[PDB]
């Protein structure tokens, strides 16, 4: 079980890597509703999530297991899929980052 969380932190480490920076930068920090001028975001997204928020909970040992870690990762992507139309640029970057997550999360 501790093997899982160690591998989970390693998966998130690569997600922060520069090789994925071209499309993973909008999800590094929490959604800045003030900076983006988003008024309806907090109304539509009942639970926001980003990559740094995962890092703090992972280092704070708040994830009971790996499945709980993946739920926040999936929650982070879906919020982008729920709020943004499918043709927008940010949805395309969220899919290309989720492909990085799904391919290693499957190979535990």
């Amino acid at each position: 079980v501790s093997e899982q969380l160690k591998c989970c932190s390693g998966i998130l480490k690569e997600m922060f890597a520069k090789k994925h920076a071209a499309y993973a930068w909008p999800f590094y920090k929490p959604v800045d509703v003030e900076a983006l001028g988003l008024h309806d975001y907090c109304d539509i997204i009942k639970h926001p999530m980003d990559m740094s928020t995962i890092k703090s909970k992972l280092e704070a040992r708040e994830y009971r297991d790996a499945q709980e870690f993946g739920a926040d990762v999936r929650l982070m992507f879906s919020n982008c899929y729920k709020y943004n139309p499918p043709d927008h640029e940010v949805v395309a970057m969220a899919r290309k980052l989720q492909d990085v997550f799904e391919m290693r999360f499957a190979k535990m």
């Binding site: 930068w25 800045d32 003030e34 900076a35 983006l36 001028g37």
Partner: protein, 148 residues
């Protein structure tokens, strides 16, 4: 056009600080040089802004339609933020000429169809109608950048 933003797609965090007593209208110059308005800023308020490196920005008074200063100059360009340090854009009031400052007061108290009704020289009727705008200030800026 010459004054335009570069399509760098490189993000950079910027803070818009309104140190002016009026509502500030931030204007962004796109990649074709055209001015595009952005949400306004109440006086004495600041907010984080997501922009990109090499983009043009100019700020306008929402009441007097006159231009405002940003970091003691007319134009603002976000640089690549270093060490994750935020870039500040202090929007302050300029030192208008007394004539232009007087025009700001007379325009705000008289409907444009009553300018000629006022008892002043006819040369001031034209100046009252010569309302400030981004287009006019952009033409003057480009001429200076064209010859230099």
């Amino acid at each position: 056009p010459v004054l335009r933003s570069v399509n760098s797609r490189e993000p950079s965090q910027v803070i818009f600080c309104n140190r002016s007593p009026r509502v500030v209208l931030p204007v962004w110059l796109n990649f074709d040089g055209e001015p595009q308005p952005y949400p306004t800023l109440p006086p004495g308020t600041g907010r984080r802004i997501h922009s990109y490196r090499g983009h043009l920005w100019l700020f306008r008074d929402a009441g007097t339609h006159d231009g405002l200063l940003v970091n003691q100059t007319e134009l603002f360009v976000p640089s690549l933020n270093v060490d994750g340090q935020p870039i500040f854009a202090n929007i302050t009031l300029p030192v208008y000429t007394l004539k232009e400052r007087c025009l700001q007061v007379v325009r705000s108290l008289v409907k444009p169809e009553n300018y000629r009704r006022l008892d002043i020289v006819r040369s001031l009727y034209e100046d009252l109608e010569d309302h400030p705008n981004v287009q006019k200030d952009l033409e003057r800026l480009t001429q200076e950048r064209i010859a230099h």
